[PDB]
Amino acid sequence: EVSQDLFNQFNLFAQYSAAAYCGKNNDAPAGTNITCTGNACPEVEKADATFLYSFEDSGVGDVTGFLALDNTNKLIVLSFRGSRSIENWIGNLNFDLKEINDICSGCRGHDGFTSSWRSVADTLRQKVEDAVREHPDYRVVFTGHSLGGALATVAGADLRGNGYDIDVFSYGAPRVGNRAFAEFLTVQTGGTLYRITHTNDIVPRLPPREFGYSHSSPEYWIKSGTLVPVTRNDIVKIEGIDATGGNNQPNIPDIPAHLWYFGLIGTCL
Amino acid sequence: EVSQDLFNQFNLFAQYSAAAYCGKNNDAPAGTNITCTGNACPEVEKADATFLYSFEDSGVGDVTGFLALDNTNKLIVLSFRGSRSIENWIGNLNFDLKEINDICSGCRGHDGFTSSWRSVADTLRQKVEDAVREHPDYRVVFTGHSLGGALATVAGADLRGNGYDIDVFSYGAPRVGNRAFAEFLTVQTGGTLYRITHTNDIVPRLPPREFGYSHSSPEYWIKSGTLVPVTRNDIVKIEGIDATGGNNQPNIPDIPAHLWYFGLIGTCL
C-alpha cells in the first residue's frame, strides 16, 4: 500500500523523531555522533549523523529537539521532541484557535503550538539557513512525534517559500488548525508534508473537529498493531481533508498506539 | 535453536509474565477474563483465561501476581510480577544469602526472595493445590519476569514433588542462590525450569558470582536485539552451571534489554 522508498523514509524519520526523546545529548557539543539508548534509532546511528545544534525548554513553549547533519542520506534534519509526559500533556490540552494570517488567509491555528513555534522561529530558521548554505544539495526535513509533530508541521508551513524545499514528516501529530489551514497544508508548495498516523492513536484525533479543527490531506495510516512491526503493506494513503476510515474513525481510541510508530517512540526503554 | 512448540510456549509465558504488570486487573474478581493494556498479552487474551486468585503487596516482600486458569491451553499459571521500578530495585538489591535446607540441604538462597516467598507460600500453595484438585489434568506453570522470575523459580523449587509437576518459565531472572541451589535446580524432577535470558540484560548478571551465586543450567538465550522480533533461530540453548557465552559474558550490560522478551515486558505502554 505504500512504496518501499516511502516506507524507508517514514522509518528513518520516525527514528530521528524518537532520537529527540532518547539517546543522551543534554548539552552534547555540536558535531558529536547521534546515538540513542534502547535501540530507538539504529538507522540514524548507522548514518554519518551528527548534531549541529541542540535546544531545550527553548522559548515560551519549552521547545526541545535538535538539528542534525546526515552525510550519508544527505539531509539537514530538524527534529522536535514531543512532551516528556504525554498522558499529562493530553489532559492539559487546550483547544483554543488563534488567527494566523502571517501564514495564510482565514487561517486559524492552535494557540499553544503556534505561539510555541513563533517564539523560537527566528533562532531556528537562522540555523537551518546556515546549513542550507554549507550543504545546498542536502534535503531539508522537519520531523517530530506528538507535540513535536505539530511543531514541525507549523514550522514547515512557516519557513517554506524561502528558496529551499522543506519536507515534513510528522508522527502521531494532533490537528493544528481550522479548515482553511488544513487546506493550506494540503496544497502548499515548496515541500511535502507526510502526516503519518497509527491505528486508533488518540492524539491525531485531538483537538476535536467539534472545536473547529481540521486535518490536512493526505494521511499515511499505519494499520499494523501496537508492538507489531510495520511493512510498506501496512500503510494506507487516505485522501481528503478530514477523511474518515484511516485514523479518524468513531471507535474508541488508545494511548499506547501513540507510542508505536515503526518502533517505540515518545518513551525510552 | 528451539522447536516451534517450545517457542510458542516461551512467547506465551513471556506474556503471562508481562500481564502481571499490565493486567487491568487486581481488585478484579475471580473468574474475570484476563486482559492487558498496550497489546502486552494478546496470546493470553485469545485463550479462555481467567483469574483464579489475585494478590497485591502480599506478606513480607510486598508480593504481587496472579493465579490463572486457562481452558484453551489446559494450564494453571501462577504469574509473579517484578518490581514497579526495576531501576531502583536493581540499585537497592542486597546480596545476602540465607540457608534453605527446607528446599535442599546445603542450599542458600537470596534472602529477600526466599523470605518474600516464604511469607506467602502457605496461602499460594493452597490456592494452587485447590486448582490442581479442580483440574487434575491441567499443567501447573509458574512464571515471572525479573524479581517475579526469581519468586517463580523459588516457589517451584519449594513446591515441587508434592504430586504434580511444576514447570517454571523465567524471563530476565536474577540469580536466586548458591551453587548447590543452582545444582538442585538443574536436576530436580517433578518439573522443568526454562530459564530465558536476553542479549546483555543486566538483571541475570545479579547477584554477581563473586558474592556466592550461581545460575542453574540450561539457559535459553535470546540473541535478537532489543525491540527486534524473536524467531526460533535467535534462541540458543546454553548448557553448564554458570556457563558463559549467553547472557553471562564479559561486556557492559543494559537495562532496555531487560525489557524486551518476545515483546515489551516489565513496563506498560
Ligand SMILES: *[C@@H]1O[C@H](CO)[C@@H](O)[C@H](O)[C@H]1NC(C)=O
Ligand atoms: C562517529 O561516526 C563516524 C562515522 O559514521 C565514525 O567514523 C566515528 O568514529 C564516530 N565517532 C565516535 C566518537 O564514535
Ligand SMILES: *[C@@H]1O[C@H](CO)[C@@H](O)[C@H](O)[C@H]1NC(C)=O
Ligand atoms: C470472556 O471470554 C470468553 C471466551 O474466552 C467469552 O466468551 C466472554 O464473552 C468473555 N467475557 C467478557 C466479559 O468479555
Ligand SMILES: CCCCCCCCCCCC(=O)O
Ligand atoms: C518541542 C518540544 C516540546 C517538549 C515540551 C515537553 C514539556 C514536558 C512536559 C511535561 C508535562 C506535560 O507537558 O505533560
Ligand SMILES: CCCCCCCCCCCC(=O)O
Ligand atoms: C515495587 C518496587 C520494588 C519492589 C521490590 C521489593 C522486593 C525486592 C527484593 C530485593 C530485596 C533486596 O535485596 O533488597
Ligand SMILES: O=Cc1ccc([N+](=O)[O-])cc1
Ligand atoms: O500456541 C501454541 C502453544 C504451544 C504450547 C503451549 N503450552 O504448553 O502451554 C501453549 C501454546
